[PDB]
Amino acid sequence: IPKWRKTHLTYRIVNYTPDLPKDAVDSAVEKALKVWEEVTPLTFSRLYEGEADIMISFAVREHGDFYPFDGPGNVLAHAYAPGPGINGDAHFDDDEQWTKDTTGTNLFLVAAHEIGHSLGLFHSANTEALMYPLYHSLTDLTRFRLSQDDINGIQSLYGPP
Ligand SMILES: [Ca+2]
Ligand SMILES: [Ca+2]
Ligand SMILES: [Ca+2]
Ligand SMILES: [Zn+2]
Ligand SMILES: [Zn+2]
């Protein structure tokens, strides 16, 4: 049961995708981190230089670690469980089309999902859970909220705020 031994994590957006403006990317990330920050003592802090606990980046096919990307479709991204170095990092396959709306793969939706892993959560059984295996969108992107199951999960590791 891997988990962070500290409630204050630091993140760094190594680079950006050509699909969205620099800002749409930062917002998706911040809104994704904030969903977990709200339901736990977890606190994130942005780093523009050096090594961060969660190294966020975009990439296609082979790109450093042990899990290459498969081009368009399928594995949209992935994250590593809590730990040192490569662990905790979140990588997004830039072979997909990251969108703020529902026209492609919603960056926020996936990012939130990935952070769930970087924090130590695996896939859930609940169909309407954020940590659900299969990626799907929603009609009102504004109506999204952490599913009950996700609350219980993230708190069993770090507890309530
Ligand atoms: Ca790391
Ligand atoms: Ca893919
Ligand atoms: Ca792309
Ligand atoms: Zn990767
Ligand atoms: Zn996943």
Curated annotation (Swiss-Prot):
Binding site for Ca(2+) 3: 70-71, 73, 75, 93, 96
Transmembrane annotation, as ranges: none
Residues at the active site: 114
Amino acids binding Ca(2+) 1: 19, 94, 96
Chain positions recorded as Zn(2+) 2 binding sites: 113, 117, 123
Residues that bind Ca(2+) 2: 53, 85, 87, 89
Positions that bind Zn(2+) 1: 63, 65, 78, 91
Post-translational modification remark: Directly cleaved by HTRA2 to produce active form.
Subcellular compartments: Secreted, Extracellular space, Extracellular matrix; Nucleus; Cytoplasm
Similarity comment text for this entry: Belongs to the peptidase M10A family.
Disease in which the protein is involved: Coronary heart disease 6: A multifactorial disease characterized by an imbalance between myocardial functional requirements and the capacity of the coronary vessels to supply sufficient blood flow. Decreased capacity of the coronary vessels is often associated with thickening and loss of elasticity of the coronary arteries.
Function description: Metalloproteinase with a rather broad substrate specificity that can degrade fibronectin, laminin, gelatins of type I, III, IV, and V; collagens III, IV, X, and IX, and cartilage proteoglycans. Activates different molecules including growth factors, plasminogen or other matrix metalloproteinases such as MMP9. Once released into the extracellular matrix (ECM), the inactive pro-enzyme is activated by the plasmin cascade signaling pathway. Also acts intracellularly.
Notes concerning its domains: The conserved cysteine present in the cysteine-switch motif binds the catalytic zinc ion, thus inhibiting the enzyme. The dissociation of the cysteine from the zinc ion upon the activation-peptide release activates the enzyme.
Name the UniProt record assigns to this protein: Stromelysin-1
Organism this protein belongs to: Homo sapiens
Gene designation per UniProt: MMP3
